[PDB]
Structures are given as structure tokens and as C-alpha cells.
UniProtKB/Swiss-Prot annotation, chains A, B:
Transmembrane found in the keyword field: no
Listed name of the protein: L-Lys-D/L-Arg epimerase
Species: Methylococcus capsulatus (strain ATCC 33009 / NCIMB 11132 / Bath)
Record family assignment: Belongs to the mandelate racemase/muconate lactonizing enzyme family.
PROSITE patterns per record: MR_MLE_2 (PS00909)
E.C. numbers: 5.1.1.-
Function summary: Catalyzes the epimerization of L-Lys-L-Arg to L-Lys-D-Arg. Can also catalyze the epimerization of other cationic dipeptides, such as L-Arg-L-Arg, L-Lys-L-Lys and L-Lys-L-His, but with lower efficiency (in vitro).
One Pfam family in the UniProt entry: MR_MLE_N
Length: 354, 354
């Protein structure tokens, strides 16, 4: 199939809804858009959203790694050799997982078009659709319930709530919300490293009481020893996010005694579908459930993540809302949202429309 | 691309060279041959050689799992959906890994032909070629040297020597063999679960002194705890065979403290290329070396093992001699032997010829 050409550009996306995360805040996001064209005319798409506090990858570095000069070795390479290409991406873009993921997506986009089916069918289909959470950032009780209701009306059945580590505020938000929802959506929480050992045992008791489904990354990334020191049943209700970048992390967390029961895979953390799939093999073997999450991102990479997600039997949760609050985007299609569930189209490849 | 027909038959192959394994003694072999034709005329090939003592799969059970009536679910299925098809093989033939492999093989053969490249390039190429060992069964000192010399003459640079557990005979054979070869070939050994703990330490001292590359399965398959009680440096020179069936075993042996340093993968154990590649992912992350082994088998499955092996960066060794001593076969091609080294032809798919 033969790569002819590659274009890379910066795109600025302001958010319709700015929000707060633990020791942070976000009004807008930059992505890198990648276009890979085939000798015979086909177009693969990819998108990068580097997260520096997690992977160490700056936007400057991401863009650097995608510079036209540094990509020459891809010219004229045969996309049917995709897994070899993915290995070489890992070797030539060792420090830029988001950049690497962008190219990786695009190649998966093209190989599926070559074969003639939606990418998911090519990776083998484990699922037709799944519910996705939408995110509520850090904010006071009234505002929280206010956003909660907006989301219910847009038809979402799952809410992901960010916690700040102040137990008084965190707990009252969760109790009020549980009340206000009256069983209309389930809830998952994300303290984002802000808790401590005694704190989490407390939060976990609430979580059981309120029927919250799991707790995402309660302790600091390096603190996985704190996780293993918890009773096994509590560990099953905890997901690793910032602790989990690639397959090496997956294996280390999965090794007995296992650190947790859920992995949150993000393309921008691991560097594309190929490494994400290695994570899934490890997780499935270890009896660990997969959650597919994201950064603030164009529909392009959300779609890529969805196709991967629906191809893994171990996939259980989706947190795929990264493109919803974008003020504009550079592509349409790739997935369909209906009544809170995410689905792919019947179009070949990623199914994106330019 | 749409499966159209599936045909299955028993073939009886006598050996040109009968041989003894610890507790066993083989004079001939039966294989099941599997032909999958596409609606467009394309032909996939697979071969099953069930090993009952290792997998519990008998020839009868294997044949039964391939009955034309038990295979109806595959008709009309699209081979471009291969990973999904393989997941189903696992559900529908859970107790018959050889039969599963035979179908898995054939399907990979077709997807590769669909794309139009040798299977190995579709899987992404990690290697051009590797040396293979040839096997010397249990037999006295003189006949061992005689067989070694026959093999040197045919150009092999690596010999795999079966040990029986009797140290006086085992050690004498290895010492003599070392002397007879000059540097002409490296030697690897395979006690097949016949050693105890005190004896293995004795064997390992010899192995270091004689420059033998490693020891395959010194202990009973269930005695994994004996491995972990060894110093790490010794564990690195040990390969797992009968202890390793599928990915579940792979993870178990790989998790810290790791039981051994090398996995011996066999399609007839794990159930085909799909599970085999799952083992490879685990092994690579754990820093375990891969060796691809076999039973007495037609070129068909040897070829398939070869494509898979040349596609995994973790592969360090081949023991692929399973089709050499067959008095007849049903196919040609698929791999080329030169000067002890195995390599694949340039033809698409498995590259077999009828
Ligand atoms: N660096 C991204 C911040 C959040 C990451 C993630 N939580 C989420 O809920 C993501 N879906 C956030 C990105 C989606 N966009 C919006 N506006 N919520 C995490 O678990 O760390
Ligand atoms: N129970 C497994 C039977 C084979 C044993 C295998 N040893 C080998 O040497 C393999 N290459 C088998 C094929 C050898 N074929 C001939 N004709 N010598 C093992 O590792 O247990
Ligand atoms: Mg998190
Ligand atoms: Mg063995």
C-alpha cells in the first residue's frame, strides 16, 4: 500500500466549558493533527494531545517529534507491515507517546481501509457499544448538581466526578449528587492522586454505601505500594491511571499481589493502539478490567480509542468524553453518540469525514 | 473474504528415524490436515499434531473437534475478522489446542494471502532467519556421536540432546559430545522432567563448564516451585516447556520471582498463533527469551511456527526440526533450510505448495 506523504499541523481548540482538576485548570487545548496519504490516494488520520505532567511530553516536544524532516524514514513504507512500523515508531519516538500515537492511529486507519472494514472489525470485535461517562470537574455542591442535570438531559447514564482531597467537600458533593440522581446515572470518582491512606479507607466506605462503581487513582503515581497494602476487595474497586503508562507498568501492577482491579488506558499515555493492545493482553490474563479514557482531544483520537476499546474482550468501562466540550473540531464522524452510548459507523477504517 | 469450504483428513507419516524420549519411544506419527477454501478460490492450510501427555488432547478428540458437523459455524465467516474468529475457536474448541491451531494456522494463511504478503510481514518482521537445533534422542554414547556427525554433515550448527535422568550416562554423553564437536556446534539439553533438585545443580555445573546454552524443563511440569528456589543466574539458563501451555502459564512463570529465563512455545500446546502471540507479549515485557519448538509435524505447521517466530522481537531460538525425519509429507515450501538456518520463502501467506 505504500505511504506517499505526511502532513502535520497545530490546531487550537477552545473549550465551551472550562473546568478544574486537582492542582490545575483548563480553558483550552492544542492538538497536533496528522495526515498520512497513500500512493493510491487514501488518507489516514491521527491526532496528538500530549500530557506533560503524566508522560513528560511537552507540546513543543510533541511537535518536534512530528517535524517533516524527522519523518522521512516512513516515506514509501508499506502499511501492510503495520506491526513492524509500530515497533519502529517506539524506537524513533521513544519520549513522545502522544506524537507516536497520532502516527499509530493513522496507520491503523489506513490498514483497515486497505482491508475494507471498520477498524474495530479488523482488530476483531468484542463489543457493539458501551456507556461513556462525562466529566464533572472540581466545583461547589450547587454547581455540581447543576452540571449533573445538564448531562442527564443530554442522555448520559454515567458521571465521572473529580475529587480534590478535601474530605468534607468531596463527601458532601457525593451524598447530595447520589440523592439528586435518584438512580438515574451511576457514578465513578477520580481523586487524582490527592488522597492518603486513612482518607481512602473512609472514601471507600462512602463509595460502597452510595454504590459508586470505582475509585480512580487515589494515591500518588509512585505510591503503588500503598495500593498493595489495602485489602484485596478494596483494590478491586480501584483503577490505575497516572500509575499506568505502558505495558511495563501494566505488568508491574498486575503482578501478584496485584495493585488494582481496573486499568485506565489512554493512547496519549502509551503511544498508540499497538502498545494499548499489549496492555490489554496483560490485563485480560491477570483478570483486570479495562477502562478506555482520554485527554481533551479531537474526535479523531477519541474514535481511534473507541475502535480499540470495542475490540478488547476485557473492555468494561469507557471514559470517552474528551471531544464533547470542544468549541470546534477538524473532523466529523468516527463514532456515534446515542443515549449515552458510544458506537462506531459502518465506514471502513476510523470512519472519519474531512 | 468469506470461508466457503472446510476439509479435514488423517495422514499417517512413518519416521525415517525412530527415537526415544524419557519415558516414551516414538516410531511414527499421525497428523490431521485442514483445508480452508475461500469463496474466491484461495486455499488455507493447517496441521494438527496433538500431544496427549502434555495437553490432554488425544488423536480421537482432536479428530472429533474437526468433524465437518462441528465446523458449521465457520461457513460464510469473513477471514478479515480473524482475531474475533480466533476468540471463537477458543470458546468452541477449548479442550483441543492442536485442532484449534490447525484452524488458526489456515486462517492466518488466508488473511496474509488476502493482503498479498508472506504471513511474517503481516505480523511485522523481527528477523530474517535463525539457526534451528536438530534432535538426538536417548541412546548410548557411540550412537550419539554417530548421529551428531550425521547432523553436522547436513549442515546443522545446533544440537538438542535428550537426557534421561541417569547422571552417569547423561554426563558421559555430554562430555564426549563436547570433545567430538570442535566448536562445530553448540549444544542445548532436554531432561524432560527427569531431574531432581540436587542433580540439576550438578547438571548446571557441567553445562557451564561445557558451554551448553541451556537446560529445558529439568523438573516435573508441576514443580514450578523448585525453579523459583534456584539462584536467579541458574533460572536464566532454564527453559520452560511442559510447564508452559498458554498465556495463563506464561504470566504465572513470568511474575516475580520469575521461574525461568526462556519459554518454549509450541502451537500444539497454546492453540495457534493467536494465543502464541499473547505469550510473546508477556515474555517480552518480562524479559523472557522465546524459543519456538514443535512435535513431529508436517511442514505445514512447522512453517506456521516459523512465520510467527520471525515476527516476534523476543524470539531467540528455534527448535523446528519436527518435519525433517518424516518419510513423506503432504506439502512443500513454507520454509527454506540453509546451513542450519530456517527462513521463509517470498510467497504470500504461509507460502506452502500443494
Ligand atoms: N489531563 C486531562 C484531565 C482529565 C483526565 C482524566 N479525566 C477525565 O474525565 C477525562 N475524560 C478528561 C478529558 C475530557 N474532557 C473534559 N472536559 N472532561 C483522568 O482520569 O485523569
Ligand atoms: N512430548 C513432546 C514430544 C517432543 C519432545 C520435544 N523435543 C524435541 O526435540 C522436539 N523438537 C520434538 C520434535 C523432534 N522430532 C524428531 N523427529 N526428533 C521436547 O522439547 O519435549
Ligand atoms: Mg485519574
Ligand atoms: Mg522439554
Amino acid at each position: 500500500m505504500k505511504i506517499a506523504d505526511i502532513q502535520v499541523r497545530t490546531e487550537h481548540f477552545p473549550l465551551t466549558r472550562p473546568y478544574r482538576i486537582a492542582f490545575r485548570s483548563i480553558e483550552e487545548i492544542d492538538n497536533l493533527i496528522v495526515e498520512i496519504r497513500t500512493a493510491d490516494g487514501l488518507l489516514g488520520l491521527g491526532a496528538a494531545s500530549p500530557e506533560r505532567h503524566v508522560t513528560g511530553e511537552t507540546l513543543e516536544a510533541c511537535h518536534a517529534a512530528l517535524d517533516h524532516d524527522r519523518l522521512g524514514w516512513l516515506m514509501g513504507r508499506d502499511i501492510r507491515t503495520l506491526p513492524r512500523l509500530c515497533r519502529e515508531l517506539a524506537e524513533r519516538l521513544p519520549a513522545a507517546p502522544a506524537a507516536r500515537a497520532a502516527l499509530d492511529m493513522a496507520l491503523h486507519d489506513l490498514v483497515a481501509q486497505c482491508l475494507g472494514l471498520p477498524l474495530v472489525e479488523i482488530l476483531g470485535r468484542a463489543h457493539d457499544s458501551l456507556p461513556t461517562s462525562v466529566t464533572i470537574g472540581i466545583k461547589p455542591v450547587e454547581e455540581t448538581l447543576a452540571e449533573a442535570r445538564e448531562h442527564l438531559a443530554l442522555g448520559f447514564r454515567v458521571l465521572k466526578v473529580k475529587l480534590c482531597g478535601d474530605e468534607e467537600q468531596d463527601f458532601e458533593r457525593l451524598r447530595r449528587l447520589h440523592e439528586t440522581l435518584a438512580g438515574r446515572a451511576v457514578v465513578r470518582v477520580d481523586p487524582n492522586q490527592s488522597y492518603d491512606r486513612d482518607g481512602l479507607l473512609r472514601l471507600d466506605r462512602l463509595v460502597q454505601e452510595l454504590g459508586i462503581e470505582f475509585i480512580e487513582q487515589p494515591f500518588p503515581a509512585g505510591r503503588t505500594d500503598w495500593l498493595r497494602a489495602l485489602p484485596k476487595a478494596i483494590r478491586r474497586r480501584i483503577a490505575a491511571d497516572e500509575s499506568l503508562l505502558g505495558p511495563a507498568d501494566a505488568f508491574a501492577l498486575a503482578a501478584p499481589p496485584a495493585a488494582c482491579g481496573i486499568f485506565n488506558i489512554k493512547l496519549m499515555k502509551c503511544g498508540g493502539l499497538a502498545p494499548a493492545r499489549r496492555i490489554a493482553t496483560i490485563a485480560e490474563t491477570a483478570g483486570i478490567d479495562l477502562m478506555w479514557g482520554c485527554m481533551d482531544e479531537s474526535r479523531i483520537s477519541i474514535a481511534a480509542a473507541l475502535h480499540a476499546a470495542l475490540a478488547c474482550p476485557a473492555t468494561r468501562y469507557l471514559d470517552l468524553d474528551g471531544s464533547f466540550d470542544l468549541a470546534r473540531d477538524v473532523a466529523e464522524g468516527g463514532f456515534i453518540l446515542e443515549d449515552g452510548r458510544l458506537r462506531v459507523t459502518e465506514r471502513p477504517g476510523l470512519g472519519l469525514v474531512y
